[PDB]
């Protein structure tokens, strides 16, 4: 099986953030599976692989753009299809960065939930 941790970054400050500011760390470990696919889950997924999406603040409803970092995307092993559905795959026993996507974002002080789906892949 897979052992998954999604770890929020400490010390994030409201206001103008750096481009690609790190906001969470995804940790996936396994003794049995060599790879995994991952997709973001929200009310507005914005690309064909589900690796960028938008999330809403609990107290304000304001949206921010989030996703895998450019560096993390370049570490993908492949993009595979599960009954026609794209999933980008990555090595198990590794970590990936979730970031604020695109150009610098001005983020309103709030709590923003992030949800990911992870599935084992045997290449």
């Amino acid at each position: 099986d897979l052992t998954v941790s999604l770890i929020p970054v400490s010390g994030l400050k409201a206001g103008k953030n750096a481009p690609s500011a790190k906001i969470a760390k995804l940790v996936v470990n396994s003794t049995t599976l060599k790879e995994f696919g991952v997709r973001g889950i929200s009310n507005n997924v914005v690309d064909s692989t589900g690796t960028a999406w938008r999330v809403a603040g609990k107290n304000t409803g304001k949206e921010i753009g989030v996703g895998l970092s450019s560096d993390s995307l370049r570490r993908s092993d492949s993009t595979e299809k599960w009954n026609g559905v794209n999933w980008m795959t990555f090595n198990s026993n590794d970590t990936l960065d979730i970031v604020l996507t695109g150009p610098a974002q001005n983020v309103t002080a709030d709590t923003y939930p992030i949800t990911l789906d992870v599935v084992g892949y045997q290449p």
Binding site: L2, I41, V55, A109, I114, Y121
Partner: peptide
């Protein structure tokens, strides 16, 4: 290759931006 449907999991976390 193949996906392992029994291994699929959803994981969530709260990201906090403070004033």
């Amino acid at each position: 290759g193949s996906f392992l449907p029994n291994s699929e999991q959803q994981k969530s976390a709260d990201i906090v931006f403070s004033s």
